[PDB]
Structure formats: C-alpha cells, structure tokens
DNA sequence: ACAGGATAAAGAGAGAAATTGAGCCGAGCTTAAGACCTCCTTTACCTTTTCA
C-alpha cells in the first residue's frame, strides 16, 4: 500500500538524517526509537519491502531446488 | 511526495467463566494363605445277566 511506500521513504531519510548526525551507520534500535516504532515492526517493513526473486535465477535454476509441498509417499 | 479526510478491520482494557491443578484426605481396589466345600476318579465288593 502507499502508505507502506511513504513509510519506507520516511525510514530511509531517518537513516540518513542520524547517518549524517552521527557520522556513523546507525543500529536497528536506534533508527526504532527516531521513528517511535517498535523494533519488531520495522523489520516487518524491511521483510516486506523485498522483492520477490524469479524462479529462473541461476543457481541450473532456481526452480529445480526447491521442494514441493505435500505428504511424503513415506508420510 | 505530501496533507487532509473517511472507514473498517484489527489490537488493548477490564472482569466473569471455565478450567485446573494441588493437597489432603479417606473409599475403592489389588495382593496373598488358608480354609473350605463340589466334582471327579478309582476300588472292593458285589449282583445280575447270557450262555455251555
């Protein structure tokens, strides 16, 4: 959602604000508490803002290593 | 990108319910020994047959 994208962009100039302030890459807490948000929700919004991977990247693909989902024949 | 506005769908606050497990008990249950009554076996002695 857009809001998702403007939270992002907001967590990105936040970084850089306190990267600049502090001369150094600021820690997961540090940027939490800028942004007044718990640690566990700005690593959802990290988990979230990847981009999902092809099934074709070479490895050979992807594809042919991951497994399928089911009862094993042995199960 | 950023601000405002509308809304619904998904969290926190409390008690009351419902469970829950915990101790502390004696009621249900098992174990073992001994005695003790049916059922059966086998004997000793018969009686009771069919036959030369």
Same mark, same amino acid.
């Given at each position: 959602?857009?809001?998702?994208? &403007? =939270? ?6 936040? =970084?850089?604000?306190?990267?600049? &302030? ?33 099934? &074709? ?13 089911? &009862?094993?024949?042995?199960?």
């Amino acid at each position: 959602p857009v809001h998702l994208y &403007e =939270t992002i962009s907001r967590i990105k100039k936040t =970084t850089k604000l306190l990267s600049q &302030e502090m001369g150094r890459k600021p820690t997961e807490e540090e940027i939490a508490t800028r942004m007044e948000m718990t640690i566990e929700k700005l690593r959802f919004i990290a988990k979230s803002a990847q981009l999902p991977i092809s099934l &074709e990247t070479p490895i050979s693909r992807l594809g042919d290593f991951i497994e399928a989902d089911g &009862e094993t024949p042995e199960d």
